[PDB]
Amino acid sequence: TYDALRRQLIPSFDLLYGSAVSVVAMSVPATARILDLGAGTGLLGAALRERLPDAELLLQDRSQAMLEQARQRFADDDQVAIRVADHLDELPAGPFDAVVSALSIHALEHQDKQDLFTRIRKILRPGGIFVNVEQVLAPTSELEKMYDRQHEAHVLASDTPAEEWAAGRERMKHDIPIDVETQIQWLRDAGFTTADCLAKDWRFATYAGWNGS
Ligand SMILES: Nc1ncnc2c1ncn2[C@@H]1O[C@H](CSCC[C@H](N)C(=O)O)[C@@H](O)[C@H]1O
Ligand SMILES: [Ca+2]
Ligand code: NA
């Protein structure tokens, strides 16, 4: 229902979230310790749990209301913990095999994104992976209009309730997105040895940084 609405609002939901799960599964052991940053209702954590039954998940968000949905989703899961913290607050010490995030970090000022990527690398073990499923800006105003048309085309094709799309539009006014290549370069600046865009559908992209490989 909520998960159905996220699929209606997010072009290539299965490709982009699935790419995040696949790249983690190919980068970390079965028993990986994983931080889901801005976990919300725990959708990305849930996708990872489906693939990695033995992974320890820490779901972190500033919103207790969002994390209540995550607590309900993971009620019977003894390998899931929840932390209430802002991206800008001290991160959990870990170390972590993976730090993942979906549709959260684009809320931060650009300087705070650059600092967050560096702070994430500090809590990753050597060879650890950072993955972001992200809302990204087009590199030009003209291309941004085309990105917007492609997003609207998906929303309309998915028979999204008009009020939910209106609410989606209102939330996006507060967003501080940047182009995918700029923020992938920020991973290199943060000291990740490899950074790559795995999958992309115009405004939405899955990218990753590796802490040594
Ligand atoms: N500065 C910040 N610190 C922590 N969480 C933040 C944040 N800004 C936004 N968030 C959280 O980021 C989430 C964005 S919605 C995405 C939720 C989830 N990752 C999913 O894929 O469905 C919300 O849960 C919101 O509370
Ligand atoms: Ca948003
Ligand atoms: Na709760």
Author numbering: 17 to 110, 112, 112A, 113 to 229
Question: What is written in the article reporting this PDB entry?
Answer:
Here, we characterize the O-methyltransferases BelI and CysG, which catalyze the initial step of β-lactone formation. Employing techniques such as crystallography, computational analysis, mutagenesis, and activity assays, we identified a His-His-Asp (HHD) motif in the active sites of the two enzymes, which is crucial for binding a catalytically active calcium ion. As expected, BelI as well as CysGΔN16 adopt the class I methyltransferase Rossmann fold, characterized by a core domain of a seven-stranded β-sheet flanked by α-helices. The HHD-motif enables regiospecific C1-carboxy group methylation of their respective malic substrates.
Due to the high crystallization tendency of CysGΔN16, subsequent mutagenesis experiments were focused on this variant. This approach enabled the production of both full-length and N-terminal truncated mutants in high purity, which were characterized in activity assays and used for structural studies. Therefore, we conducted structure-based mutagenesis by introducing non-conservative alanine residues in the HHD motif to further explore the metal-binding site.
